[PDB]
Amino acid sequence: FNLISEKCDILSILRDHPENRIYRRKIEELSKRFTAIRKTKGDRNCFYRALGYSYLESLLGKSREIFKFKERVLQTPNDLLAAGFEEHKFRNFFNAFYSVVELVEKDGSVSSLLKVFNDQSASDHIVQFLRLLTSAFIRNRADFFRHFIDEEMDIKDFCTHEVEPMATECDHIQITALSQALSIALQVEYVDEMDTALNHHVFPEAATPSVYLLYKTSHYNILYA
Numbered sequence: 001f002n003l004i005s006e007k008c009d010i011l012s013i014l015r016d017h018p019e020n021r022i023y024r025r026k027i028e029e030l031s032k033r034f035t036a037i038r039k040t041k042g043d044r045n046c047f048y049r050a051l052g053y054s055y056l057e058s059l060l061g062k063s064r065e066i067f068k069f070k071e072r073v074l075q076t077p078n079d080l081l082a083a084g085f086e087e088h089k090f091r092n093f094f095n096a097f098y099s100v101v102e103l104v105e106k107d108g109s110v111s112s113l114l115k116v117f118n119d120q121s122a123s124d125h126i127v128q129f130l131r132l133l134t135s136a137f138i139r140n141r142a143d144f145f146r147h148f149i150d151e152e153m154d155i156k157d158f159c160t161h162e163v164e165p166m167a168t169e170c171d172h173i174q175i176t177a178l179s180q181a182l183s184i185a186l187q188v189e190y191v192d193e194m195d196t197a198l199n200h201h202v203f204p205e206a207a208t209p210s211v212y213l214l215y216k217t218s219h220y221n222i223l224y225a
């Protein structure tokens with residue numbers, strides 16, 4: 001369980017910041033709304049790895065939701081081709097993601113899904129797929145990302161340097177783009193060391209979340225309501 005842990009009690013993370021007044025306060029507050037947490041490895045890939053695992057776990061046993069998600073995943077090669085990616089270069093990554101969606105359908109256990117996401121090879125193939133899809137979706141909607149995020153940013157360079165490579169840290173743009181690309185609604189809880197309110201953001205603004213994440217160190221862990 002070196003990439004995604006077993007589930008633990010929310011207060012078990014007090015030991016990560018002992019004798020830190022503000023962290024203890026915010027984690028005690030968080031424990032009033034959430035019951036459990038999984039930790040993720042802090043290797044620069046944890047946003048992609050955590051969102052992929054938590055969303056697929058939320059689909060287990062839901063036959064209509066699985067059918068609709070598979071239908072969207074089967075169209076994602078078209079997104080990649082429209083952005084200029086070549087099939088022979090994304091095939092191995094697409095195939096790995098499609099395989100784990102079929103596991104959700106056919107096997108349906110938490111145990112088997114957690115084993116794939118802790119297999120360094122399968123899990124890193126899945127992460128690389130999600131990074132190419134994120135880049136494709138931004139490139140195909142460049143005017144949207146300039147209008148609503150940052151009129152001055154260089155979209156092609158940003159995707160090349162901060163989205164596609166393994167181990168590159170995320171910001172708000174990648175979260176928004178992958179949420180929209182796969183129709184995943186997620187809520188992020190923000191825990192920093194300032195004497196401020198524990199707060200959160202939903203992606204997209206209006207939606208009922210399927211996934212909850214805890215953000216603290218440039219790091220994302222998985223929460224359970």
Ligand SMILES: *CC(=O)NNC(=O)C[C@@H]1CCS(=O)(=O)C1
Pocket residue numbers: 041042043044045046047169217218219220
């Ligand atoms: C989501 C993800 O992989 N985050 N990366 C880390 O947690 C890296 C740590 C935060 C600062 S560091 O790079 O020194 C260790």
